Amino acid sequence: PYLGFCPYCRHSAPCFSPIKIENVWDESDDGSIRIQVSAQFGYNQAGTADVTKFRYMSFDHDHDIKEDSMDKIAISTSGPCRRLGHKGYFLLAQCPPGDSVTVSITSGASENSCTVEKKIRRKFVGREEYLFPPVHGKLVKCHVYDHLKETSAGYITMHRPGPHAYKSYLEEASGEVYIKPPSGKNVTYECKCGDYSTGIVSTRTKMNGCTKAKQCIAYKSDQTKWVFNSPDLIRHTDHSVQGKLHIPFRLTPTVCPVPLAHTPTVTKWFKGITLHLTATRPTLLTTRKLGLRADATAEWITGTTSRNFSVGREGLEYVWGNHEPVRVWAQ
Amino acid sequence: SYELTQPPSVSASPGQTARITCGGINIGSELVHWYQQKPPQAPVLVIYANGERPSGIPERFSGSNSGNTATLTISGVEAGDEADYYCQLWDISSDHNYIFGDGTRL
Amino acid sequence: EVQLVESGGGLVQPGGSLRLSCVASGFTFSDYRMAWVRQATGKGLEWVSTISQPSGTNTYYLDPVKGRFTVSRDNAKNTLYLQMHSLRAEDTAVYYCARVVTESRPPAAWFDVWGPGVLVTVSS
Hints:
This is part of a larger assembly, with chains A, B and C. Chain A has no helices and 24 strands. In chain A, a hairpin with a 6-residue loop joins strand 1 (21-25) and strand 2 (32-41). Chain A has a domain at 4-161 and 246-255: Sandwich (Immunoglobulin-like). Chain A has strands at residues 21-25, 32-41, 53-57, 65-69, 73-76, 82-94, 98-107, 110-120, 138-145, 155-159, 170-172, 177-179, 187-193, 195-201, 205-207, 216-220, 227-228, 244-246, 251-258, 265-269, 272-289, 297-310, 316-320, 326-328. By secondary structure, chain A is mainly beta. In chain A, strands 20, 21, 22, 23 and 24 form a five-stranded antiparallel sheet that branches. In chain A, strands 1-2-6 form a three-stranded antiparallel sheet, with no helix packed on it. Chain B has strands spanning 18-23, 33-37, 44-48, 61-66, 69-74, 84-91, 97-100, 104-105. Chain C is an all-beta fold. Chain C has strands spanning 3-7, 10-12, 18-25, 33-39, 45-51, 59-61, 69-74, 79-84, 93-103, 108-114, 118-122. In chain C, the strands form two sheets. In chain C, strands 2, 4, 5, 6, 9, 10 and 11 form a seven-stranded mixed sheet that branches. Chain C has a four-stranded antiparallel sheet with strand order 1-3-8-7, with no helix packed on it. Classes of the chains: A mainly beta, B mainly beta, C mainly beta. The B-C interface holds B 31, 33, 35, 37, 40, 42-43, 45, 48-49, 54, 86, 88, 90, 92, 95-98, 100-103 and C 37, 44-47, 50, 60, 62-63, 94, 96, 103, 106-112, 114-117.
């Protein structure tokens, strides 16, 4: 539930927000995309698993963790996306094609959105372009993200949280620097006003020899969390791998339906054929001779047309879309 | 004030791995440092910052720290490892005190 | 070569005073915090005092040695100093003058270079 330096905020500019996307994945054949942010989805304050609500960073000087519900999160690239699942840092969602991806949290009028560029194109499988999986068609081998949230595409490492400096912990009065920790909290302070000097103060505390607040820093001794190795956070010195969590929504194998293009009409002339073809969408026709030279040809076709293809005594083979290979032998 | 406790002794024939533990309240939240001594020669730092070492320390030495326990792990013990070992930390809330452990002999 | 050499120790009566000197070489004496650390015979190492850098404005001491032992430094001759007053029997020990390497965040201090040490004995 840390904060990342999102490049594009709600308004126009970069900010530091809980909802920074720091990586995006779209290799799934069905168009589903896996997203990675700094929030913890499906978790309450203590981290207990509960789908209905999630936890995230809080815009306050104590910077505790505060929580919200599923219904107020939205995802969109060009039009609104549909959430397919969520766990911890990661989301899975189905999105319309677009050039960027945006995640927005809507706490009433507080609509905090983070946007990151990523070209997501409508992708298909098979040898025929199609908008939608056909109701009827061949069941061909495909690979798509598994909706099971307990799966694992891998593992990501996390480390002890690094520094989190503040100047609200500091205060200037009559050209003197004081540290004001939150009530009952031991806050680690360190400063250099000439000599370098460190310490921990749990209460309103003076420091001497200091006239500028820029020379001193204070921050909580917060080891009670684990943070992803993000580039947007200055790091703890002991950056050993202190935890490995799974990468849900493994890219699993399955079968997908793909369309069946028009059955060609063969029109034959001496040592050659004339295939009359219809294909509303881009369909791949490939051919190859069966002699010493394949002379293989490939072509993506739309509309209706006709192709004259010489066939020799050795023969010819062609595949029209997802149909089976067809072989011929001339005389 | 933190109190650092180590076992008074650890026995290890050569060839295996030896663990020496430093015990203290909530020492996992601080950075421990392990020093090795052959009396009367001055000790030598072998671990600092819970996971990393000065130059020249062989690859067998490693350190860890978590919760209430820090651990010095010495894989493949040899006769030369027989030494005194002291865990150290810098309790800065206690007026910049440098607290050492009681010590352990190998 | 980075080397720290102690001197000045010996036998002193209880209630006496002494001045331990430590000359430094091989590094910028003004750039590093320094310390005196103690080891009694058959006991563990125990920290005595630290003097900061470059001017040593802030000096930190162990609790019983406050008000009696004082650290000082001089960057011109690269020499650390510990003056002792009202010496007592348990001060009998070997003292190492130690260079201090301090890392800002998290605040952590560990000693890198030590001198061979010098003995003081406090007995009647």
